[PDB]
């Protein structure tokens with residue numbers, strides 16, 4: 001029945017209404033799994049999860065997703081995502097806000113909450129296509145901004161964009177952050193929807209703290225559930241969705257509070273969440289834009305992929321990610337899965 | 348109308364059913380005040396509260412309550428409370444568990460969760476009548492156990508009990524903890540329902556950390572609400588209850604998570620809550636026992652108080668505390684106000 005559903009899915013035989021319904025149900029089951037009848041039990045559940053993280057490696061399973069997803073061609077990414085190719089929840093002020101506007105508003109929100117000021121050294125960990133790196137570099141000309149990514153395609157895209165934008169204050173480190181060794185410290189460290197690719201947050205935060213001084217601030221933004229934590233993994237044997245979107249071990253969804261338990265080496269200063277309708281609007285805009293540019297996307301992908309079938313596979317994956325993300329983040333008007341943000345200083 | 352209600356109350360003219368109803372309503376209004384429509388707003392509210400604490404003195408307003416309540420005669424306290432005169436939520440396994448049994452079960456739970464082991468030095472901050480100090484001293488003969496209290500009556504009670512119980516490993520420091528200076532460190536620091544009498548938790552935790560080594564553990568138990576924090580203060584102009592029970596500035600009710608934001612100098616290891624029906628059962632047992640020993644209580648109090656009217660005042664205060672506490676802690680079957688517990692080590 002799994003192979004059946006997957007079969008129809010790949011062959012575009014599941015209508016959008018049915019697809020949305022199916023994925024919503026899967027998320028409903030995660031909610032039933034995660035909510036406990038008493039706060040006593042809720043904390044026992046959450047603490048068990050947190051403790052389990054401390055017995056893992058720093059890194060999640062990243063190898064496959066890096067090769068398959070994070071090393072996709074920039075030109076395909078341009079046809080699906082907004083102008084700066086942001087791959088993270090964006091911020092929509094108005095009904096009529098476009099994805100390009102929502103990217104910029106999100107960048108501004110991060111600069112505000114991370115207390116970016118001109119002249120600082122800034123490290124963006126898991127910088128993606130570098131929308132935030134480029135935003136900070138252009139807005140704060142005396143900042144030096146470093147992006148760090150384990151993707152060659154991302155690094156190359158950023159450096160080309162910086163050259164086109166006449167920015168002189170940008171560099172990019174190509175590194176697996178879990179393996180990166182350096183004595184360098186930064187005034188500001190930003191981690192936008194990258195920590196989900198880590199497991200042992202204790203070890204990750206420890207390493208980040210060694211790249212901070214007493215003057216530094218660390219800003220983290222992560223997909224969350226407000227109440228409980230879960231790995232982004234099949235809820236049961238009927239769950240065709242979760243393991244299609246991300247490989248096992250790749251992505252953790254921390255609760256909105258989970259990082260409060262990872263203060264061995266940094267100390268919290270502030271804590272927010274952004275309602276999930278912003279993320280819902282983000283994935284919806286991506287889905288609609290991919291649909292609009294569907295023919296173009298297929299043409300871009302066909303060389304490097306080799307077959308119309310393999311192209312349709314990548315497209316189905318991205319589109320289904322958006323359709324499913326819509327149900328996840330819009331659930332109960334954005335009050336289940338959402339985005340958490342925290343500001344820390346070093347011990 | 349306030350003076351009216353207070354008038355009838357002091358004159359025993361409010362029946363129990365009406366009293367319970369009135370106080371429940373007051374707690375209902377606190378719930379409406381504290382629950383926000385979105386987690387975004389809930390965190391904004393909670394963070395504002397936490398930030399406000401960092402701009403206060405370490406100590407709450409303790410002077411009046413110390414003189415009026417914490418310096419009451421032990422013999423009166425014996426007639427209202429359980430065998431060890433525990434003044435904190437206790438733990439009831441069974442329908443038929445007595446307050447004396449519930450005190451002991453609570454003491455055992457603290458020893459378990461604080462990881463007490465024979466041979467450790469132990470400091471009990473705000474030790475009350477020393478039930479926990481005496482429990483640890485008797486169960487772990489190689490432990491040295493120090494109680495600390497700002498009450499002369501409490502110190503004197505504990506030292507007499509230790510002498511009667513043939514304990515040689517107990518001492519008591521008479522000190523305001525917010526003023527206590529010492530180079531002494533302890534393997535274990537316990538704070539059972541005392542932190543509610545502090546305000547600036549940042550300064551309080553900082554001081555406790557200076558009394559810890561790398562080997563120490565800090566265990567805190569505090570009355571909480573699961574979701575939000577509040578001062579125990581009049582909700583509005585109709586609230587005759589809150590300011591009758593505690594003086595303004597005396598008692599803070601932290602959320603179940605609030606202490607997670609006070610990790611500048613200590614780091615969390617574990618976190619629990621105990622459902623509020625345990626506290627409800629605790630105050631109910633006190634209320635019933637005071638009622639049973641009402642005539643005796645009045646006789647004990649009459650000397651030091653000087654008038655039957657002033658005696659009735661103290662009795663009304665304690666009884667109303669129990670009646671109101673019942674409504675507070677039993678609200679929604681113990682799933683609103685409850686007891687939070689956390690275990691920390693030093694940075």
Ligand SMILES: COc1ccc2c(c1OC)C[N@+]1(C)CCc3cc4c(cc3[C@@H]1C2)OCO4
Nearest residue numbers: 069087088089193194196223251318321325
């Ligand atoms: C498909 O292009 C993406 C677009 C946006 C995001 C990701 C994408 O994939 C590469 C992945 N991030 C980075 C990791 C964490 C994460 C987990 C999610 C999510 C978005 C995320 C975030 C945001 O929706 C459910 O679960």
Ligand SMILES: COc1ccc2c(c1OC)C[N@+]1(C)CCc3cc4c(cc3[C@@H]1C2)OCO4
Nearest residue numbers: 416434435436540541543570598665668672
């Ligand atoms: C009346 O004898 C008492 C009996 C139990 C307790 C206290 C008593 O007073 C001295 C006060 N503590 C210590 C401080 C914190 C606190 C706050 C409370 C409470 C109990 C508490 C605790 C637990 O019920 C609503 O709010």
Ligand SMILES: Nc1ncnc2c1ncn2[C@@H]1O[C@H](CSCC[C@H](N)C(=O)O)[C@@H](O)[C@H]1O
Nearest residue numbers: 070086087088126127128149150176177192
């Ligand atoms: N171990 C690792 N080391 C370095 N970068 C990593 C990594 N695991 C994942 N990444 C990167 O983390 C990012 C996650 S996607 C988020 C990208 C960007 N912050 C944005 O908001 O658009 C991608 O750049 C991915 O390449």
Ligand SMILES: Nc1ncnc2c1ncn2[C@@H]1O[C@H](CSCC[C@H](N)C(=O)O)[C@@H](O)[C@H]1O
Nearest residue numbers: 417433434435473474475496497523524539
């Ligand atoms: N500033 C301060 N310094 C020292 N003790 C204080 C204090 N403020 C309050 N206390 C003490 O804190 C205790 C609160 S009542 C709890 C008593 C005991 N832990 C029990 O569980 O029964 C009382 O002993 C009170 O005297």
